[PDB]
């Protein structure tokens, strides 16, 4: 299986604009984003007893013969580097490692084995 490595940043000090078209708006809340991210990609699902299946998409990007990456999370690290006077964070840096996932039934169909069979 293929491996994927990604790094990104959350910033809430009020200098990065929000891409919604309103004038005077900047990003100012890190904790909410960390919370929704961890709930979506990391925690256990109460009905399946395991984490969720993920698909990664970036507009018109193509990995190959497909337009998305089907995966599971295997590694994550967060660094908090800037704090408010009440203790709430102002900047977080995240590093993640994903691995490729594809079902049995579909795998044997992708290998369209042609033989004297």
């Amino acid at each position: 299986p293929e491996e994927l490595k990604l790094d990104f940043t959350f910033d809430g000090t009020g200098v990065v604009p929000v891409n919604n078209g309103k004038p005077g708006e900047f990003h100012q809340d890190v904790a909410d984003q960390v919370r929704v991210f961890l709930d979506l990609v990391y925690s256990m699902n109460s009905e399946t007893h395991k984490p969720n299946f993920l698909r990664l998409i970036w507009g018109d990007f193509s990995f190959g013969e497909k337009n998305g990456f089907d995966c599971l999370l295997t590694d994550l690290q967060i660094n908090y580097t800037l704090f408010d006077q009440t203790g709430k964070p102002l900047r977080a840096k995240l590093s993640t490692t994903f691995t490729s996932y594809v079902e049995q039934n579909r795998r044997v169909r992708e290998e369209g084995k042609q033989s004297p069979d």
Binding site: N19, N20, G21, K22, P23
Partner: protein, 473 residues
């Protein structure tokens, strides 16, 4: 409450700038601060009040009128010796009251609502009277509010056709005058019950004949049909009638009311709980105006005003009262008159969805869609507010450059978000201001300043066409 001894006590429980509705109708209390708006029967105070929640609504305006036409049947199955083996109950209503603001506020907030304005036009009464003059006075008062962007009349279906048309014409006229508002309408259905299969064809034929102004139709939209939801009725305990049936026989009326089964008066608590549940399982019928503005607010707060508010499932809904077919929808969103009506339909495995996004000018090349009209309203108002700090300045080039820079910055922010088409900003908009281009010497001498703006907006897609091709190898 009052607290003297230190400790822990338990008590009962006490923004989208582009989607702010005004709901005009009759309420229960209307008590704000130390003034009672209903003190004098012929001198009422008409004043918009800003509300953020159901609790804040209830603090000023209260709850709904008690119903008096509810019946409950208890079905007993017994043994061959008269011993009881099982007991069931079920409920029915004969004629609901035409006062529905509280239920409308519940349905509105359940679907993603936010801050709104309430205008009371009088108290709710047991007579069930709705009058045109009170509603028009409420509209004339809401004209004062500035923050409003949407006009809703939840009770308008109780009017006759001429009064309905008069009210809708007044609303469209003031949206055309103020240039920042939009009207949402419901279609009137016949009162024959059970509804015939082709009611909606006659209903739309009746709608198409109303005398609406031809030049203001782009400022409103119409939806259909009514919706069956899960909210509970309010009732007076001693007014509920109780019937019984045994082993599937005919029903007979007993001599106690629901009040005679209350343990507080010496009744049976088990049968009382059974009757309460039977009443709470009745479905309640609403017009689909509140749910739609709630969906407008949610959609603008997640995608933007340029996204069409359709193809999303509705909350707290059991079903639509009518089922609309393909042959019938064929004549609803495209019609020689242009007065399109937006359908609400159910799909297998999907639920109940809004299916259509056209205005009452559905054949117009520019104002066909709801989202384009609302985007233009938003952009014009924001540019106006940005321009206001330049009034009373000298009328010369040193001001024209500042105004131009401000407008271009706003439009660039709009281009990055994906509301405007084009690969480069120069393909999305233009702004122009200057002597012998937009102004003459006389306008400059008279104190006038003129700016020309052009914009390219994205549009939604209704149809998908598949085509297959084949290569030989």
């Amino acid at each position: 409450s009052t607290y003297k001894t230190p400790g822990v006590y338990i008590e009962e429980i006490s923004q989208v700038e582009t989607a702010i509705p005004a709901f005009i109708g009759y309420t229960q209390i209307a008590k704000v601060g130390v003034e009672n708006f209903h003190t004098d029967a012929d001198n009422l105070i008409l004043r918009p009040v800003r509300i953020t929640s159901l609790l804040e609504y209830e603090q000023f305006f209260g709850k709904a009128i008690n119903e008096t036409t509810i019946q409950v049947v208890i079905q007993d199955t017994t043994d061959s010796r008269g011993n009881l083996t099982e007991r069931k109950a079920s409920a029915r209503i004969t004629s609901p009251s035409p006062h529905n603001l509280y239920y409308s506020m519940q349905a509105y907030f359940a679907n993603g609502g936010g801050p709104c304005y309430i205008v009371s036009v009088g108290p709710m009464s047991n007579t069930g009277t709705i009058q045109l003059e009170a509603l028009q006075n409420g509209l004339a008062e809401v004209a004062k509010e500035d923050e409003v962007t949407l006009l809703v009349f939840p009770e308008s279906q109780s009017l006759s056709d001429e009064n309905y048309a008069a009210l809708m014409s007044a609303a469209l006229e003031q949206c055309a005058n103020l240039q920042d508002r939009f009207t949402v309408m419901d279609l009137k259905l016949p009162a024959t019950r059970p509804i015939p299969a082709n009611a909606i064809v006659g209903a739309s034929n009746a709608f198409r004949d109303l005398s609406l102004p031809q030049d203001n139709l782009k400022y409103g939209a119409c939806y259909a049909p009514d919706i069956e939801t899960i909210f509970n009725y309010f009732y007076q305990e001693d007014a509920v009638t109780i019937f019984r049936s045994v082993n599937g026989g005919a029903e007979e009326q007993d001599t106690l009311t629901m009040a005679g089964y209350n343990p507080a008066n010496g009744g049976d608590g088990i049968q009382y709980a059974l009757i309460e549940s039977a009443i709470d399982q009745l479905p309640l019928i609403l017009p689909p105006s509140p749910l739609v503005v709630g969906q407008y607010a949610r959609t603008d707060n997640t995608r933007g005003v340029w996204k069409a508010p359709a193809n999303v499932a509705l909350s707290s809904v059991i079903k639509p009262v009518l089922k609309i077919t393909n042959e019938q929808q064929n004549n609803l969103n495209v019609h020689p008159t242009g007065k399109s009506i937006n359908a609400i339909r159910a799909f297998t495995g999907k639920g109940t969805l809004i299916w259509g996004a056209r205005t009452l000018a559905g054949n117009d090349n520019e104002w066909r869609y709801v989202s384009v009209r609302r985007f233009f309203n938003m952009a014009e108002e924001s540019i106006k507010k940005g321009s206001e700090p330049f009034v009373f300045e000298p009328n010369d080039a040193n001001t024209w450059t500042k105004v131009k820079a401000m407008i271009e910055n706003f439009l660039t922010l709009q281009w990055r978000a994906g509301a405007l088409a084009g690969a480069k900003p120069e393909q999305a908009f233009y702004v122009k201001i200057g002597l012998n281009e937009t102004m003459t010497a006389l306008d400059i001498l008279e104190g006038r300043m003129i700016v020309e703006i052009g914009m390219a907006v994205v549009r939604p897609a209704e149809f998908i066409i598949l085509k297959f091709s084949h290569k030989m190898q």
